[PDB]
Amino acid sequence: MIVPVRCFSCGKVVGDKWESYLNLLQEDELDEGTALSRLGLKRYCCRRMILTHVDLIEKFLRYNP
Template sequence: MIIPVRCFTCGKVIGNKWDHYLDLLQADYSEGDALDALGLVRYCCRRMLMTHVDLIEKLLNYNSNPSLSLFFLFCSFMLELFDCL
């Protein structure tokens, strides 16, 4: 699944922070420090990023149909493209 665009509880936009969150985690930030750096102070918004599981990447590992795999990659590319607009 892709990260929801808004927090389910308060409605704050969080969908644009997912890639930055992953970049900060790879730069050896702790989860709390990364969320603080992104300006997420409400625990409901923090929960949305900390508990998100990227299921599309996990499902692609078990796909036996290569054309379906390409379809998922195309869909994820289009989602990233529209997210940048």
Template sequence: MMIPVRCFTCGNVVGEHWEEFKERAREGDEDPGKVLDELGVDRHCCRRMMVSHRDLVDVVSPYQ
């Protein structure tokens, strides 16, 4: 699915950082922890949302 707009635990906005995080950490060679630090994602719950997210919208959409 798509990245949630807000963190499930604390309610901070995390969706606005997803594209840059994906470009730099997932498709680039940068360390995900350093990228999250530079983006200002400090809380562990928000970091968990970013690091553990899998983009499944292309997989699920044919079945809707």
């Protein structure tokens, strides 16, 4: 639903890099690969955490009650 708080495999805190990562794409027009390394996500376990997440909450919020 939402950015997991931490990387399943190692623990890295990642629940604080979703908005950044999102901006690093739109407003800076970077690519996910470069975007991720610039967020400090160097090892692929943490990378997949963000690169793969699906923000379904944004769709839930569209429901009235």
